[PDB]
């Protein structure tokens, strides 16, 4: 029984809140992929890969983004294999954010 449940939020800004949450999804990998995530099976797939370690989610290699500076704050709160998670990271624009997971940020 994998205690696994996350919530992701995103909004323009550089900190937790002075950065209103504009989009929010939930993801569950255990037992099977679900949640409000337009790409549950993969994000799950994603975390598995890296063993639920935000901080090790290789960027692109393959994608170019615009060099507009319009920061986005991403938040991840929950548990992975029953380990508590509370990550936060500001990407310089949203394209940057997206070119980051493959699918976690597939939102």
């Amino acid at each position: 029984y994998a205690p696994s449940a996350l919530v992701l939020t995103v909004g323009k800004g550089v900190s937790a809140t002075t950065a209103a949450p504009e989009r929010a999804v939930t993801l569950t990998c255990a037992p099977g992929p679900s949640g409000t995530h337009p790409a549950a099976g993969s994000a799950c797939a994603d975390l598995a890969a890296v063993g639920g370690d935000l901080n090790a989610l290789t960027r692109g290699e393959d994608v170019m983004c615009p060099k507009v500076y319009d920061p986005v704050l991403l938040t991840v709160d929950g548990v992975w294999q029953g380990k508590r998670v509370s990550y936060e990271r500001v990407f310089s624009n949203e394209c940057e954010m997206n070119a980051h997971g493959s699918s976690v940020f597939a939102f």
Binding site: R59, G60, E61, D62, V63, M64, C65, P66, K67, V68, Y69, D70, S92, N93, E94, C95, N98, A99
Partner: protein, 275 residues
């Protein structure tokens, strides 16, 4: 009424326009998200899309590309803003999708179109952290073919003392542009590293947006087209200076700012470059 964004003035473009140098007959390819050909303050000559699922270069679903185009060549009339090279022929080479993402090969193909349609200046306000063989070959081939190639340095601020300059900006063949504010202060977000070449205005830069609109953006993305427009002015004064002479000019006539790790050679000054 037409206003003049502060960036245009900071680099001394109006000095040249007054002597009749406006960028005329110079072909600039804006490699980006497309340009809204329908905007009143722009005149797009032609272009093409390397984006499989968005094949109209004149439809900018992201707005970025339209803003960049306007800093290069917004028209010189009694409305809107004013580009660095208001008479430059502007080409929309669309390589970024509505969400702003483009595959490397889209980019590469766009440069390849830029070369074969005889562009003089290429502006690329895009970047990614890895380089590639095909990518380098393509930018290097552009330079061999005699095109001036300018790119935004990146927006990863500083990081210890390692370089934060992305690609294509990181390549020696490319002019890499960092961003200063109206105060000649480096924007906190501007990438650093020994690969940065020159600085330009990149903090709340007014330009055109799709839908007959205007707005201000921040980014090394907004600094790039200032250098690209600058390059077009010099070629309009000196139509058979080489890309090498244009580059050199821009680089040797800068106003020096801090150490070169954060400022390259400093702020470009097109009046001075044009001699």
């Amino acid at each position: 009424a037409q206003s003049v964004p502060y960036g245009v003035s900071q680099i001394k473009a109006p000095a040249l326009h007054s002597q009749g140098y406006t960028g005329s007959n110079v072909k600039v390819a804006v490699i980006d998200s497309g340009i809204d050909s329908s905007h009143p303050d722009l005149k797009v000559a032609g272009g093409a899309s390397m984006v499989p699922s968005e094949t109209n270069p004149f439809q900018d679903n992201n707005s970025h590309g339209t803003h960049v185009a306007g800093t290069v060549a917004a028209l010189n009339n009694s409305i809107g803003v004013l580009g660095v090279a208001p008479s430059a022929s502007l080409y929309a080479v669309k390589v970024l999708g509505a969400d702003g993402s483009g595959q490397y090969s889209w980019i590469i193909n766009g440069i390849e179109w830029a070369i074969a349609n005889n562009m003089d200046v290429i502006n690329m306000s895009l970047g990614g952290p890895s380089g590639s063989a095909a990518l380098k070959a393509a930018v290097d081939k552009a330079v061999a073919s005699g095109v001036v190639v300018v790119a935004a340095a990146g927006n990863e601020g500083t990081s210890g003392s390692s370089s934060t300059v992305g690609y294509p900006g990181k390549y020696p063949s490319v002019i890499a542009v960092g961003a200063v504010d109206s105060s000649n202060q480096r924007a906190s977000f501007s990438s650093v590293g020994p690969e940065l070449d020159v600085m330009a205005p990149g903090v709340s830069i007014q330009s055109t947006l799709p839908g007959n609109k205007y707005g201000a953006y921040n980014g090394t993305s907004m600094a790039s087209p200032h250098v690209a427009g600058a390059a077009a002015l010099i070629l309009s004064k000196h139509p058979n200076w080489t890309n090498t002479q244009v580059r050199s000019s821009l680089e040797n006539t800068t106003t020096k700012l801090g150490d070169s790790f954060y400022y390259g050679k400093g702020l470009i000054n097109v009046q001075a470059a044009a001699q």
